[PDB]
Design a protein around this ligand. Sequence first.
Ligand SMILES: [Ca+2]
Lengths: 69, 69, 228, 228, 69, 69, 276, 138
Amino acid sequence: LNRKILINSLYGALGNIHFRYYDLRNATAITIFGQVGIQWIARKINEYLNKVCGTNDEDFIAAGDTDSV
Amino acid sequence: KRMEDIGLEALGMNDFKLAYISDTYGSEIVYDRKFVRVANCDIEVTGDKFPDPMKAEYEIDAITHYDSI
Amino acid sequence: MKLSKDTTALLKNFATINSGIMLKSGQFIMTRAVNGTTYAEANISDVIDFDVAIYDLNGFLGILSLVNDDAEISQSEDGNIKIADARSTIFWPAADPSTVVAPNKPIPFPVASAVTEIKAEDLQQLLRVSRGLQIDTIAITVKEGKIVINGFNKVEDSALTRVKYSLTLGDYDGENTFNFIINMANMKMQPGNYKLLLWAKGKQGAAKFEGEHANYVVALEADSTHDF
Amino acid sequence: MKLSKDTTALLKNFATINSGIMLKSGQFIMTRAVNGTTYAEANISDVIDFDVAIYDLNGFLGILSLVNDDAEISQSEDGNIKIADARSTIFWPAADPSTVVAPNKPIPFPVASAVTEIKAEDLQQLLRVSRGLQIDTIAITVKEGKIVINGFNKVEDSALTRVKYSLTLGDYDGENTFNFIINMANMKMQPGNYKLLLWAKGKQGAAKFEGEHANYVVALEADSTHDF
Amino acid sequence: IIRQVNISPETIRGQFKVHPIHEYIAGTAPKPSDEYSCSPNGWMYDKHQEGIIPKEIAKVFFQRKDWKK
Amino acid sequence: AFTNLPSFSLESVAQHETKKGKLPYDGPINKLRETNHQRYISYNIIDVESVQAIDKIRGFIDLVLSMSY
Amino acid sequence: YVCVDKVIEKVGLDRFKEQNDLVEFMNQFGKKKMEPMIDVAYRELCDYMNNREHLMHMDREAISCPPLGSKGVGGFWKAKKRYALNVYDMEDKRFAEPHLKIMGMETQQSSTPKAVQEALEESIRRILQEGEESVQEYYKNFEKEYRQLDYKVIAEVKTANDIAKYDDKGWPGFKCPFHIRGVLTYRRAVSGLGVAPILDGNKVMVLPLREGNPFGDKCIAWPSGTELPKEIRSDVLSWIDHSTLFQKSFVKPLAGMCESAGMDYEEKASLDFLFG
Amino acid sequence: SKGVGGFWKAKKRYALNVYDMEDKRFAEPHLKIMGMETQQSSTPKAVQEALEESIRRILQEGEESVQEYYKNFEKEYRQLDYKVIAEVKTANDIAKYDDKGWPGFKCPFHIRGVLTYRRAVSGLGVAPILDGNKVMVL
DNA sequence: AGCTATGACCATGATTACGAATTGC
DNA sequence: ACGAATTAAGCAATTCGTAATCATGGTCATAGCT
Ligand SMILES: [Ca+2]
């Protein structure tokens, strides 16, 4: 839990203007790549489930947030 | 600061550029508009989304800089 | 005074138009709309010897119907109306004539551009449908040599291109074309047979419904377009 | 197609169930309530020649009552409703069939578990009395070897044991027992004599009022217990 | 206002009895004072002694009048 | 300036005062570079000339010089 | 603001063969009554306050008045900081033509389209210069000619976000504010055309459709700057309530202004012509 | 059974009858819920337990069980303790609204209750409602 | 003397924008 | 809109209450007909 709170504190720190190494480009790249990754996995799950089930254009994904889905 | 922390009023003028100017000139100043250089500028940026002044993602391609001198 | 049943039946329909009235001497009863949109006239068989302005005319009629027909109407001692019954006496306040909106002279109706007639049941059905389907404008026009009346709602259509009601009134042999617009607020005449006269010239138009007892005059909206 | 006056009365009684009732080609009409707690149907002599869905059926009937019985009702050039009389033409907006909550198919009511007959006078008295005593729940049950219908109150009595109304209905030699109840939002049948049928299974039941003109079906609430 | 009635910081001579606004607007309130001028806020302003802010305002007004002439 | 124009866009003020109309253009700004680059650069140069003209007629740089001196 | 309705009447309008003569008499009696009155008033004020000197001078800045021989009203007031004056001689600058000094109305405001702004300014000029009948005829002819104007300038424009909004196959979901419902209608109409779907945050033009439309909605919304597919655009153009927008943006301000000046912008067409 | 198994309500609002969690097979299924009223602290404790059990019945038992338990808890609600049924939201920005112990401009419900408690008896020297604390509202 | 159609009202219902409290990845 | 010296994990989301505004049901009042 100590290590986890440290790691989770890193992302919060990287968005603080008073951080020594703050760069808005870096934080926005992290978060936008998170968005793109979760939606990419969403699309891949949708396609694979459509193939395996045999039907098409069906949204099998209930809902996803960040890493969880 | 010392007069401030003892609650004693300190006179004079606080800002010092004005005091420097007053002592440096004193008399009224005669000027010619030609010698002072005024640069009138504008830029043009092309971007899909509305360009953001704060982050400036897009490139710069058109600059106009008019010099009076 | 002694007012018969027919006179009361006539002037209650007139009371529906204008609450007040200005009963003058003679055998001619007149009413005008407060906003001057409808103007009604009738001739009665009762003698009138003094003039009086009535404000709550409907209550006056309620009192009259409450009492016997041979009740006598007089100028009361307090500058008001006195109703003497066979056994009772009633007092009714007299309104100031300046506070009653009444015509100052009979209106000579000009030469009618169009002449036709409408039956009692036709007008009755028209009024009931008018209350039912929320129509507020009625257009009198021509269609294949026949004069027709249509219903339009100004609230939903200001251009009047949605036919909701339509009736055929009579034949029309001519080439002058017309389309008159009447608001439903002026269609306040009593049920009964009527003769309809239409007059139009430039931006001056009017209509007249004359029945067996009473006559009504209705203004025409400026949106009406005629070719006379 | 023309609608008889009896058809109009039946349509108005059916309008009570739902302000908007759809119509189909044929001679069988049918509807349900918005919450599905009451259903009705009828077999009328007149045959409808076109499908149409009406939203303000009460208003439509009120307008229809203003014309003669020989009025011809049919679809118009724009898919709306048009009523042609001898001299008049009524336009009515045909509603979207989707925006009317109407039953999809006629209900094949199963075999009745219980059968009796309610006289016209009984229902006529009960419906008017229920308003007087503020009775909003009325329960039919089996008592002393007979079938009787007693009314209670619910606003202050959640136990449903405070007895306010009682009515002896008939005899029943049935070993099956039950206490069915109906709210007054479901009692909308017109005065008349109806065969009353009762069905109940699993955890739900229903009651049926079949008549010489129309049939009604009413739901039975949660407290309507049956021991079959 | 600043010129005709001195509102310079140092010309405050003390407080003045404040009446309701209606008394001042209707003229019903008595004359405040003859020695020093007053304002509806109710602070005594010197009449005999000229302030500094109205002096500057008068100087700028005179310069404006001369330059407009 | 004490002038309350309906909109403070450069085109609006230049039209109101210099009475010189901007050359009309087609499409959106972002595609304007790739459609007519000549037109794009000429528009930017005109813009700078228009601000120079409003300065010349109103005479504001001289005003700020007179202020500061 | 002074000189309402008394001084001019007290003397008589008959003394003015020309509106300019009325303006000259205005100047004459203004100079007659201005300096001594204001002088003694502010003298009383400074003496009451007993200050060193008095430095407050009045000066007639703006003079408005209805044009002579016309039924126009000239000047009215709507509310605080909302007023229009038919000014003639502003700060000693005689004008050959009237100047409509307007503040607070929709004319200078850019919420309405430029055509609507021009129409509003013309209506204001009409109510202040000639009067009722001209306002009526102008209103009628503008109603006649409004239907032919481009829909790009006579329709609504609004932002669009949360395109889904619990779409549920056309179901409004979260009470589509008369423009997201139009977005849904446009999406349903263009089904099969392959056009670009509407995205979040896009500016969309909205056109209310006539009642009983095949679209199934009394409004439609397509991305602003684009046009509805001509195939469906012709249909949406046939079903337009130019009236709805007209009563929203144009009729309401005219009604408010006319009732603020004792006027009526819709002809009543009474029977009084036959009454006399 | 007749249980739904799992259901959703909105973004970050869902309830699931989890059987295994990270390769840990559970002897009996246990409820996993994120967002609804049984995790929101502001909802009352007794209400928390009641609606948590109702959610469990929804996810495992079925409609009839939900109706039966709703009727049972409707019966049970009247004779419960006052402290265990109340919203427990915090309070902030004290000087925005207070006057004579009465609500001010845009006074929230909990703050209105706080001011009413101020008017209640007072003068006993009990701890105040200074911001950062938690208060039950009734 | 009473039923009933309709205007007013008084509150009621409904929708919108904004502040606030609380989760949860 | 120039105060001027300075400082410390982030965002997306729901849900409720309050304040503003428009549409309307139940009921009362008016009244009109029988
Ligand atoms: Ca997780």
